[PDB]
Amino acid sequence: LVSTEAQIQKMSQDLQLEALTIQSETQFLTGINSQAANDCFKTLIAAMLS
Amino acid sequence: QRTMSLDFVTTNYMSLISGMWLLTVVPNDMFIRESLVACQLAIINTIIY
Structure with missing residues (x-):
């Protein structure tokens, strides 16, 4: 996979999330890691075959 | 003539x-x-296109 500390650091600059205000762009990064990709790729293929 | x-x-x-x-x-x-192309492509998709 793309290295998670090298992808989420490029992602967090394009959002330009400010450290002070409650905005709807701090929730763009919740729950992205290596394990959630390997369990969504399986449950898409394995549900289609069944 | 070392290739960089x-x-x-x-x-x-x-x-x-x-x-x-x-x-x-x-x-x-x-x-x-392989290092000339991946740097020329990074200028293309970011600065100029």
Whole structure:
């Protein structure tokens, strides 16, 4: 996979999330890691075959 | 006549503008092709297109 500390650091600059205000762009990064990709790729293929 | 290689980070928009000064001075037949293309493509998708 793309290295998670090298992808989420490029992602967090394009959002330009400010450290002070409650905005709807701090929730763009919740729950992205290596394990959630390997369990969504399986449950898409394995549900289609069944 | 050692063939060089480019080692850069795509999250750094100043090393891509400073990479426009190497390719306009040093001949492009000297950098290795797998590092000349991945730096020329990073300028294309970010600064100029």
